[PDB]
Each structure stands twice: as structure tokens, then as C-alpha cells.
Design a protein around this ligand. Structure first.
Ligand code: KBB
Ligand code: KBB
Ligand code: BGC
Ligand code: BGC
Ligand code: GLC
Ligand code: ZN
Length: 257
């Protein structure tokens, strides 16, 4: 039911998901001047060398690249995190034009897109239990700006023609998500939520400071996807981002001095 349009988008979600107006909603604007270095953060560990990708799915809202999370392969640890968080999927949010598309903003600046690598805390056994816990999930967020092509993204771009419409999927084995990272792991972190319904307040957000560059041609192919199913009137999959939400009683901490 929910979506991104005038009649079912972010301003309507609260009617079926009242937590939309909650105390730790995401995304937020990251005021870089107010964010404070936190010496209590431990080194961040992104351990993706044994990742096992499986499938890419157009879910009608974005596309998800899904991973085998049946044991610790790709995991995120350290930083603000207590315990091991297993990678389950990644997806993006993007705009109709380069000047918008990110969910988080940096001193109010919107990036062209934002990558979310989604992980669940293994002490809760399964994703469904994890989303009943305040520390159930960790999402690693990475901004995309338009410039040079990102070679590690091209395999994703080139399969999108095969999943144009809602409900289509394709095999997507042997994809290495390490090729989507920037050089630096400097980050900001804060407690928040899922950015789509059901908007559950379970997420430790870790948002990298350094964007990745992707080419205009790469993001233009994201914008050829469809929200609609096969045979239905074409609705381009663009502007699938939620705007920044009130920070409320939170502080954004920085990993860097
Ligand atoms: N609250 S909502 O965005 O899920 C929503 C769903 C509908 F089917 C119709 C209107 C809506 F506002
Ligand atoms: N955009 S998000 O990373 O907060 C997210 C991840 C999920 F697994 C489910 C819903 C979401 F909204
Ligand atoms: O095929 C993508 C990646 O899959 C992983 O499981 C392997 O360990 C990596 O060496 C490889 O780059
Ligand atoms: O009371 C002082 C403390 O205030 C908190 O809001 C800050 O997060 C801490 O960094 C600071 O030491
Ligand atoms: O790595 C993800 C995918 O990249 C390319 O599409 C390959 O042709 C395919 O075999 C692989 O599954
Ligand atoms: Zn997301």
C-alpha cells in the first residue's frame, strides 16, 4: 500500500505506521559541526571477504541484492556495535535527478543516491526477532555522488534490465560487495529506524563520510527501473527516499577527530 508518491508517500505513512512520528526515526540530517568525536567507539570491522550473494529482486520500492545469512560470512563488527551483525541484503535509494536521492543529508546537502548494507544482530537468531530489539540491526550507509564510474557497481547496473518490474528477480551469485565501499571508513553513527514501513526503531546507523563516485550512466540505469509490475502502466522507480526526520533526543557521534 505504501509507496513514494503524492498519495501514498512519506507524509502518509504515519496513518498505518504511527511510529513514523516516533522518537528515533531515520533518516536524519547530519550536522557535521555538532557531531562529536567519540573516543569510546572501537575500530570498525567490515568483513565481507566470504560474502555469498544469491539473488537480486525488484520489490516494487527498490532492488535488493540478497546474501546467504545462514552463517557468519559477511559481517559487521566494532565501532558502536556490541556483537556480530550479519549481512542480509543491500539496496539503494535514489532520485529523479542528481541533486536529490539520498536519505541522510550532510549539513542539509542531498547526494544523488545512498547505499544501505543491512545487517542483523546474530544474538537474536533471525532478522524477524532482531526487529523486535532496540539493537537488532546495523545499516552501513554510503553516499553516491556522480562523477567517475564505480567499477564494482557495474555488475549491478547491467542486470537491472532483467528485473525491470516489481516481483522480478534474477540470479546474482558471486558478487563482491567490497567493490562498493569508499577508501575511508570514517563514519558518523546514531540510533534510528528503518526508513521505510514498518519504520521500526531497531537500527544502529553507521554512515560513511566519504561518498563513492558513480557515473551518470550508472545512476541513469537505476532510474529506468519500474515501481509497477509487468503489463501495468509504467511508473519510473525514482525518488524512493524518505526525507530527514526530527533528531529529537539524539546525538550523532563521529569516529574521527
Ligand atoms: N499509510 S500508507 O502510506 O500505507 C497508505 C496506504 C494506502 F493504501 C493508501 C493510503 C495511504 F496513505
Ligand atoms: N532502508 S533501510 O535500510 O532502513 C531498511 C532495511 C530493511 F531491511 C527493511 C526496511 C528498511 F527501510
Ligand atoms: O565472488 C565474489 C566473492 O565471493 C566470496 O565468497 C569470495 O570469498 C571472494 O573471493 C569473491 O570475490
Ligand atoms: O555530560 C557531558 C556529556 O554530555 C553528553 O551529552 C555527551 O554525549 C558526552 O560526550 C559528554 O561527555
Ligand atoms: O556477480 C553478479 C553477477 O554478475 C554478472 O551478472 C554475471 O554475469 C553473473 O554470473 C553474476 O551472478
Ligand atoms: Zn534503505
Amino acid at each position: 500500500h505504501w509507496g513514494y508518491g503524492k498519495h501514498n508517500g512519506p507524509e502518509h505513512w504515519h496513518k498505518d505506521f504511527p511510529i513514523a512520528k516516533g522518537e528515533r526515526q531515520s533518516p536524519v540530517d547530519i550536522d557535521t559541526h555538532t557531531a562529536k568525536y567519540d573516543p569510546s567507539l572501537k575500530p570498525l570491522s567490515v568483513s565481507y571477504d566470504q560474502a555469498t550473494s544469491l539473488r537480486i529482486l525488484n520489490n516494487g520500492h527498490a532492488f535488493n541484492v540478497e546474501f546467504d545469512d545462514s552463517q557468519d560470512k559477511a559481517v559487521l563488527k566494532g565501532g558502536p556495535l556490541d556483537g556480530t551483525y550479519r549481512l542480509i541484503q543491500f539496496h539503494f535509494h535514489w532520485g529523479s535527478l542528481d541533486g536529490q536521492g539520498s536519505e541522510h543529508t550532510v549539513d542539509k546537502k542531498k547526494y544523488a543516491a545512498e547505499l544501505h548494507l543491512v545487517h542483523w544482530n546474530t544474538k537474536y537468531g533471525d532478522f524477524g526477532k532482531a526487529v523486535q530489539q532496540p539493537d537488532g540491526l546495523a545499516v552501513l550507509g554510503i553516499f553516491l555522488k556522480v562523477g567517475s564510474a564505480k567499477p564494482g557497481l557495474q555488475k549491478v547496473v547491467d542486470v537491472l534490465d532483467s528485473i525491470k518490474t516489481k516481483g522480478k528477480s534474477a540470479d546474482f551469485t558471486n558478487f563482491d560487495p567490497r567493490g562498493l565501499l569508499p577508501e575511508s571508513l570514517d563514519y558518523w553513527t546514531y540510533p534510528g529506524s528503518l526508513t521505510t514501513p514498518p519504520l521500526l526503531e531497531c537500527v544502529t546507523w553507521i554512515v560513511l563520510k566519504e561518498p563513492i563516485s558513480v557515473s551518470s550512466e550508472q545512476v541513469l540505469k537505476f532510474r529506468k527501473l519500474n515501481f509497477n509490475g509487468e503489463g501495468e502502466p509504467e511508473e519510473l522507480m525514482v525518488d524512493n527516499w524518505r526525507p530527514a526526520q526530527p533528531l529529537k533526543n539524539r546525538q550523532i557521534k563521529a569516529s574521527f577527530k
